[PDB]
Write a protein that binds this ligand. Structure first.
Ligand SMILES: [Mg+2]
Ligand SMILES: [Mg+2]
Ligand SMILES: [Mg+2]
Ligand SMILES: [Mg+2]
Ligand SMILES: [Mg+2]
Ligand SMILES: [Mg+2]
Ligand SMILES: [Mg+2]
Ligand SMILES: [Mg+2]
Ligand SMILES: [Mg+2]
Ligand SMILES: [Mg+2]
Ligand SMILES: [Mg+2]
Ligand SMILES: [Mg+2]
Ligand SMILES: [Mg+2]
Ligand SMILES: [Mg+2]
Ligand SMILES: [Mg+2]
Ligand SMILES: [Mg+2]
Ligand SMILES: [Mg+2]
Ligand SMILES: [Mg+2]
Ligand SMILES: [Mg+2]
Ligand SMILES: [Mg+2]
Ligand SMILES: [Mg+2]
Ligand SMILES: [Mg+2]
Ligand SMILES: [Mg+2]
Ligand SMILES: [Mg+2]
Ligand SMILES: [Mg+2]
Ligand SMILES: [Mg+2]
Ligand SMILES: [Mg+2]
Ligand SMILES: [Mg+2]
Ligand SMILES: [Mg+2]
Ligand SMILES: [Mg+2]
Ligand SMILES: [Mg+2]
Ligand SMILES: [Mg+2]
Ligand SMILES: [Mg+2]
Ligand SMILES: [Mg+2]
Ligand SMILES: [Mg+2]
Ligand SMILES: [Mg+2]
Ligand SMILES: [Mg+2]
Ligand SMILES: [Mg+2]
Ligand SMILES: [Mg+2]
Ligand SMILES: [Mg+2]
Ligand SMILES: [Mg+2]
Ligand SMILES: [Mg+2]
Ligand SMILES: [Mg+2]
Ligand SMILES: [Mg+2]
Ligand SMILES: [Mg+2]
Ligand SMILES: [Mg+2]
Ligand SMILES: [Mg+2]
Ligand SMILES: [Mg+2]
Ligand SMILES: [Mg+2]
Ligand SMILES: [Mg+2]
Ligand SMILES: [Mg+2]
Ligand SMILES: [Mg+2]
Ligand SMILES: [Mg+2]
Ligand SMILES: [Mg+2]
Ligand SMILES: [Mg+2]
Ligand SMILES: [Mg+2]
Ligand SMILES: [Mg+2]
Ligand SMILES: [Mg+2]
Ligand SMILES: [Mg+2]
Ligand SMILES: [Mg+2]
Ligand SMILES: [Mg+2]
Ligand SMILES: [Mg+2]
Ligand SMILES: [Mg+2]
Ligand SMILES: [Mg+2]
Ligand SMILES: [Mg+2]
Lengths: 55, 56, 185, 159, 58, 172
RNA sequence: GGUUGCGGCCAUAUCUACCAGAAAGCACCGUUUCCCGUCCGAUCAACUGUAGUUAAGCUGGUAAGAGCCUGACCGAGUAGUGUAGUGGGUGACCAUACGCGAAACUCAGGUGCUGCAAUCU
RNA sequence: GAGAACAGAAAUCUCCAGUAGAACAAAAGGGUAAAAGCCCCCUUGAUUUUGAUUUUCAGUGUGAAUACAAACCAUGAAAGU
RNA sequence: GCCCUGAAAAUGGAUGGCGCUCAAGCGUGUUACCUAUACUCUACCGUCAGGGUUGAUAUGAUGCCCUGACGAGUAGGCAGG
RNA sequence: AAAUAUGUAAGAAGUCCUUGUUACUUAAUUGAACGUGGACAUUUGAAUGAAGAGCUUUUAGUGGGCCAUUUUUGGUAAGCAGAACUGGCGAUGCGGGAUGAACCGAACGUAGAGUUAAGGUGCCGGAAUACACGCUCAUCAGACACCACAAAAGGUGUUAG
RNA sequence: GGAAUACUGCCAGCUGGGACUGAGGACUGCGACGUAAGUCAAGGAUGCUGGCAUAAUGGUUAUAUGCCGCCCGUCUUGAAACACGGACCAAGGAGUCUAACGUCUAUGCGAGUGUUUGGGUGUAAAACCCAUACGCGUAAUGAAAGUGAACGUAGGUUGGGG
RNA sequence: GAAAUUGUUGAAAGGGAAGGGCAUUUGAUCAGACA
């Protein structure tokens, strides 16, 4: 919800350490942008399928 | 839809050969290690941060 | 790998025990760490670390510097604590009474305290009288009055006292020390 | 060989602002400075006396002293890995009052207002500044406005 | 035997290890450089209000 | 760029107090997901109006499904494509069952014949060729003749083990 | 509103050409005993407010005026640019991805505002 | 630019236009128009004392420069310089 | 666009080799798959840090117990051996 | 007249009231400076982070550097010479580029399971002689960055415009 | 007109095959299931069965096989180098001691401190004892003649552990 | 009575060096631990 206390709430959480994705990255090269067929930058709602494969 | 106020960032890039300015932003966002994610609330003042680190 | 934001495996940099080997000092420590663990009292935590400090960071507190601190308003019935030796000062002609808890009192210093009907107490005697350090006044000696700090920060226009053996004129007083020879500092 | 003199490299830096040459207008000398003011430094090529060195061009500092024709300014200039305190003696022609604090001075007497005018009302303040937030949802109408469909255009030449 | 003339290479890495330390602020800065005419009188002004606050405890 | 979808994308020109309710432009965009399509939308709008994504807003994004996905259609296509030595417009014709299938093999063709990667091509227009004999290109016309038939000579069957005991037959 | 004295900003106040300006003011204007200055009472100085004049200054208005000022999804999201790739090309160079973004141009509007004191149908 | 005996491309005289297109020792770049340029009038502050400051910098020295303080003076009706 | 001509050097020889021609070539798409001292989880060693513990009547107080994070290295420093 | 880069500010060392000191300054208790007394607490004044911050002393080695992207000077050029910002190598192994100081990936305690990166999967050789649409037949075809070169100019070869 | 389906997403829905690991060592916590008593998969593996009791398992070693592996030392931007030294082995073989010193640290004593020139004494180069001096410190500043440290609770102000 | 280095005897390997790392087969050898 991005609460009034989000700053204290979020800083309390240690940075999540995810594993590499399980289905791989779906791309041949990570270091272009998502739009360019790589993995980086804002991929919007697609951050979930990635993060889920890394969690 | 009201544009998203909450974003989750995971560092995709390894530790080395990173220019200084993106490299500090990475630290201040607590992504100092590969595949380590955090939550970031979206405002202009963190939006510019996400801009600096997009390739990593 | 981790992009390291700070130097890894860094020691606190603060003394942990005394570097001294004196059993009694070790025993005094043993006392005050216990006290400092279980009393939640600021005085004991401070006193613990003062026992760690080297002879340089324990400048002597003079009996006259003591007499002064009791002239603070409401300070005259407090017991002064000096973690370190206490020295005599022939320059005060009237020393008050009090009770002084130190590591050491020089011959002359303990005399003058007792001659006025005061009390010289070892730190452990003070722990028994004041476990939480009640009614105490801690005094530190003048750290930076060592001869060595005179020469620290030596350099142009710093006014800092050369490292010199023989002195007088003819010794490091001419070119660079005065406008008429070369320049001035 | 090399040439490193005091005004070296300052060709356009001390130049006069096109069609702005000539006397300095009289307000520049009616302005009044006190110790503690923040001033901006811009050197005026027309006044050769009391000129700041080119390093302090475009630099802001705090006046530490006030004399007949001049104000002293202190500037933190960083040499090596540290900052040192430089104090400069400047003619008033090279110095203007800084606006750098006006949004703070505006906001203090404003935050004082909505403080009193709230507490005396029964609190509910929120006077810290917030960044640009993402915008809310909204409903855009089609009334009088139907989408106009555009496509990419072909290659032309026209020269 | 020619050799490299100069570079600033590596110099801002060195500067940033221990440093670019911020300027060190103080309440009550020095009067160093302040007008003697001002400062001479100021010496007396303070001595005046100091003498005042003494006769304020009597 | 992938298996393609088609997207109505609508965006406008952020509101101002002096100019509320700005003008609302639509584009159809072939993209593999909705994130490319929005980037692609903004790519063309900055090529036409004075806007950039910063000063503007996407009002809506909608997938368009083929109206008759099982009916074979003859498509003419209109393309602008940069090449090494200069940029050129084109018209090709594609026979397939969906606009999305059409755009797929277009991009494949531009890559095979003209060495054009996805970034170089612009789709100008794709539209259904309604009457036949508005088909203008011979490689499609071949397939519109009445009572069409062809054999598939020299048939090659994929073997599932390293050895065979017979000897193949390309018969069919 | 006018005008004057002293101004602030210092062309929306400047430039070119014409036309108009009541009352007051300013001005042009008259004299050379005096202080004062010149090759020359033109400038400068003194004396008159008398003997004359709106001609000039000055103020204002006119002009598909020159200039200048302001604005605009006019041009142009162009040129340039920060960031990215084991992108294209023999190369020169170029395209794309996330951002920032001019200048000319074109068009429209405009042509001093204003502080203190005195004065005036 | 337009005018005046010898006088001509160039002599001295006059009016108009003139944003500096000139000059300010010198290289160049700044700067400057009731001036910073030209002519004249009066002068010695190009003086005395000892600090601070800026550039170069190690924040040493030297060179050069800045803004005050304390004299004694110049000049101008004066503010001032 | 690909291909061909343009296209000449010295021991025999190199898309790494074999070999490959609706490729095992060129462009482009889609899946699966392989494997770094990297990432995730666990054990153990060490370093640093934060806690806890002098109550006797047994054996370590520089000790004992809990918990977390970290670990490349020439010249070089210090430390424990 | 940009982009990038750059100075300062974002409070308790703050803000407002009252009215003391002086030899400075004012026509002047005018001001200037420093104050005595009084009013308002942490949504006390943007974001994010903070294995804390501040400070002192002493001493090693070094004072031949070299490379890459971008900016860039001299030179026809150079694996040439000289600058700028960053990142590397030097001082550093590990996976990849066959090979290789500097490229890509990723930085090292001893190990187990899993997942990957860059790069690959006919056979050498772990891994599809996978799927799909085209293109190409070379009497010196071609085959992946840095990279181990090829140009003008031509073809009634073939492909699509 | 009424459904189905694909695609994407969610379920604190159920369920199968496989792999590695089993750190800890009474109790203590948070819970779960039960009417209950009890029970449990809830702050880290137990139960049941079998085999050998041995070179079976394990260590060492030689060999073979798969993959990998250039010569060390040195100076150097860069060495396996077509740079140098080194055929082999043993044994020697290089930051020392002294004078005077800086920072730090331990210790004694402290406005002082230093017995060891010397003397006394001795179980005799040791240990023990000691008068006078001297050294450094306790005053500074001037080239020098010289002069020489409280207006005050040994000052005011701001921060300041306790 | 070491080492370099040599003879004999025993064992083993050897298609243009040898030596080394991880791992296992085979041979040789050996510790501990069952009860
Ligand atoms: Mg799967
Ligand atoms: Mg898998
Ligand atoms: Mg790849
Ligand atoms: Mg997982
Ligand atoms: Mg965060
Ligand atoms: Mg001394
Ligand atoms: Mg002293
Ligand atoms: Mg030069
Ligand atoms: Mg220099
Ligand atoms: Mg001068
Ligand atoms: Mg030489
Ligand atoms: Mg060289
Ligand atoms: Mg050098
Ligand atoms: Mg009249
Ligand atoms: Mg008229
Ligand atoms: Mg007038
Ligand atoms: Mg006009
Ligand atoms: Mg490129
Ligand atoms: Mg470009
Ligand atoms: Mg030099
Ligand atoms: Mg010079
Ligand atoms: Mg292959
Ligand atoms: Mg292919
Ligand atoms: Mg490992
Ligand atoms: Mg290490
Ligand atoms: Mg050890
Ligand atoms: Mg900044
Ligand atoms: Mg925080
Ligand atoms: Mg902390
Ligand atoms: Mg050194
Ligand atoms: Mg040195
Ligand atoms: Mg040198
Ligand atoms: Mg690099
Ligand atoms: Mg080296
Ligand atoms: Mg390195
Ligand atoms: Mg490396
Ligand atoms: Mg290669
Ligand atoms: Mg390699
Ligand atoms: Mg890169
Ligand atoms: Mg082979
Ligand atoms: Mg295989
Ligand atoms: Mg290629
Ligand atoms: Mg290339
Ligand atoms: Mg052709
Ligand atoms: Mg399972
Ligand atoms: Mg166990
Ligand atoms: Mg056995
Ligand atoms: Mg065995
Ligand atoms: Mg046995
Ligand atoms: Mg054997
Ligand atoms: Mg090998
Ligand atoms: Mg060499
Ligand atoms: Mg060689
Ligand atoms: Mg040699
Ligand atoms: Mg030799
Ligand atoms: Mg030996
Ligand atoms: Mg004897
Ligand atoms: Mg005796
Ligand atoms: Mg005697
Ligand atoms: Mg002496
Ligand atoms: Mg003396
Ligand atoms: Mg013998
Ligand atoms: Mg071996
Ligand atoms: Mg046995
Ligand atoms: Mg046994």
């Amino acid at each position: 919800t991005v609460g009034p206390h989000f700053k204290q709430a979020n800083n309390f959480l240690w940075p999540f350490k995810l594993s590499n994705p399980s289905g791989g990255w779906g791309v041949p090269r990570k270091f272009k942008h998502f739009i360019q067929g790589g993995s980086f930058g804002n991929r919007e709602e697609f951050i979930n399928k990635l993060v889920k494969s890394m969690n | 839809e009201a544009q998203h106020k909450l974003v989750f960032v995971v560092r995709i890039k390894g530790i080395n050969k990173i220019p200084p300015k993106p490299r500090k932003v990475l630290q201040l966002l607590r992504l100092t290690r590969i595949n380590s994610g955090t939550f970031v609330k979206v405002t202009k003042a963190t939006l510019e941060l996400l801009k600096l680190i997009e390739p990593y | 790998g981790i992009d390291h934001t700070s130097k890894q495996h860094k020691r606190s940099g603060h003394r942990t025990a005394p570097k001294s080997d004196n059993v009694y000092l070790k025993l005094l420590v043993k006392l005050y760490t216990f006290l400092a663990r279980r009393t939640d009292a600021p005085f004991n935590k401070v006193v613990l670390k003062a026992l760690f400090l080297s002879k340089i960071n324990r400048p002597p507190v003079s009996v006259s510097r003591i007499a002064r601190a009791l002239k603070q308003e409401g300070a005259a019935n407090k017991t002064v604590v000096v973690v370190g030796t206490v020295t005599d000062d022939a320059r005060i002609f009237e020393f008050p009474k009090t009770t002084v808890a130190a590591l050491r009192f020089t011959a002359g210093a303990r005399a003058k305290i007792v001659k006025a009907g005061g009390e010289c107490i070892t730190l452990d005697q003070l722990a028994v009288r004041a476990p939480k350090g009640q009614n105490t006044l801690i005094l530190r000696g003048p750290r930076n009055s060592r001869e060595a700090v005179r020469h620290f920060g030596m350099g142009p226009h710093k006014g800092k006292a050369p490292r010199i053996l023989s002195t007088g004129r003819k010794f490091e007083r001419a070119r660079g020390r005065r406008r008429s020879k070369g320049f001035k500092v | 060989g090399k040439s490193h003199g005091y005004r070296s490299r300052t060709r356009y830096m001390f130049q006069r602002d096109f069609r702005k040459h000539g006397a300095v207008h009289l307000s520049t000398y009616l302005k009044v400075y006190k110790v503690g003011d923040i001033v901006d430094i811009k050197a005026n090529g027309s006044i050769q006396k009391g000129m700041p060195h080119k390093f302090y061009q475009g630099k802001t500092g705090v006046v530490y002293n006030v004399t007949k024709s001049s104000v002293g300014v202190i500037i933190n200039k960083m040499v090596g890995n540290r900052y040192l305190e430089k104090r400069l003696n400047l003619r008033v022609e090279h110095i203007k009052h800084s606006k750098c604090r006006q949004e703070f001075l505006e906001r203090v007497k404003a935050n004082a207002a909505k403080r009193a005018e709230a507490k005396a009302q029964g609190v509910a303040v929120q006077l810290k500044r917030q960044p640009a937030q993402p915008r809310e949802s909204r409903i855009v109408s089609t009334e009088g406005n139907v989408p106009q469909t555009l496509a990419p255009v072909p290659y032309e030449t026209f020269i | 035997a020619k050799s490299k003339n100069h570079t600033a290479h590596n110099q801002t890495r060195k500067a940033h290890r221990n440093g670019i330390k911020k300027p060190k602020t103080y309440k009550y800065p020095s009067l160093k450089g302040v007008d003697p005419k001002f400062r001479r009188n100021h010496k007396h002004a303070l001595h005046g209000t100091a003498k005042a606050l003494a006769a304020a405890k009597k | 760029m992938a298996h393609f979808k088609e997207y109505q994308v609508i965006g406008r020109r952020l509101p101002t107090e002096s100019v509320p309710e700005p003008k609302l432009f639509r584009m159809r965009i072939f993209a593999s997901n909705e994130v490319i399509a929005k980037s692609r939308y903004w790519y063309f709008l900055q090529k036409l109006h004075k806007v950039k994504k910063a000063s503007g807003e996407i009002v809506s994004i909608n997938q368009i499904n083929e109206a008759h996905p099982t009916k074979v259609k003859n498509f003419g296509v209109w393309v602008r494509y940069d090449s090494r030595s200069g940029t050129h417009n084109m018209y090709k014709e594609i026979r397939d069952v969906s606009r999305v299938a059409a755009v797929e093999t277009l991009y494949q063709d531009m890559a095979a014949r003209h060495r054009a990667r996805f970034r170089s091509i612009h789709i100008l227009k794709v539209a259904e060729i309604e009457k036949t004999a508005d088909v203008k290109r011979q490689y499609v016309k071949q397939f519109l003749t009445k009572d069409l038939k062809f054999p598939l000579p020299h048939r090659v069957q994929k073997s599932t083990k390293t050895f065979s005991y017979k000897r193949p037959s390309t018969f069919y």
